[PDB]
Amino acid sequence: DLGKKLLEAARAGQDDEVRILMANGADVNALDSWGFTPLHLAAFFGHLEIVEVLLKTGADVNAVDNAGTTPLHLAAHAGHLEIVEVLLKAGADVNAHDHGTVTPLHLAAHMGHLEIVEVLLKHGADVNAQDKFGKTPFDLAIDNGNEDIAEVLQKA
Amino acid sequence: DPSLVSFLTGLGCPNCIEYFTSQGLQSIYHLQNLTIEDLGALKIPEQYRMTIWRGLQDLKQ
């Protein structure tokens, strides 16, 4: 149906179909079986033009999937700096956490995304945030030998 | 696949993702039927193992 095809188009980077399907009656916040919205999928797969189109058309910047993950979590993990900046400007919750109490900064730290780590820090990201296993962004940057990030995370 | 990133995020062990992707397991579907024994074979630390297993059982019906 329209919602499924919009989720598929957003994942696949099909910007015309994204625009057409919403005009035809697809909910901009259609859900897949994991509770992903089109914005979640566009944010993870790096489709900035589609992220922008969805936000313009009323996408929930802070939508949570069935595991409590937000588009900002996915963009930070996946290292999409331009998307992370566009989500933060649109009011993305900088310290969103789920059970696992894992924040976007945790994921950027782990995957070695320096510039995203800095941008999150600049929007008041919590360096003191512990996951369910008492690990902080700092702990994950060490465990992964990400030295520059571990450094910048002490620096605050 | 974002489902695997999101799953492990929800459970508190995003640092566990490479134990799955190093075997070419990319999505939550690829994990659904792993055993307790299988999670040990993947060399997931006991800190995290049973948390991951219970999470996978919670997805079943």
Residue numbers in the entry:
A (entry chain B): 3 to 100, 102 to 159
B (entry chain A): 4 to 64
The study reports:
For the development of target-specific protein-based binders, Designed Ankyrin Repeat Proteins (DARPins) are well suited, as these proteins are small (14-18 kDa), highly stable and, in contrast to antibodies and nanobodies, they do not contain disulfide bonds, making it possible to use them in the reducing cellular environment without reducing their stability. DARPins are based on the Ankyrin repeat fold consisting of two antiparallel helices, connected by a loop to the next unit. For further structural understanding of the interaction of the DARPins with their target domains, we solved the X-ray crystal structure of both DARPins in complex with their respective target domains.
We also solved a high-resolution crystal structure of DARPin B9 in complex with the p73 SAM domain, which showed a 1:1 stoichiometry, as is also indicated by the ITC measurements. The selectivity relative to the p63 SAM domain is mediated by hydrophobic contacts to a variety of non-conserved residues throughout the SAM domain, including P491, G499, P503, Y537 and T540.
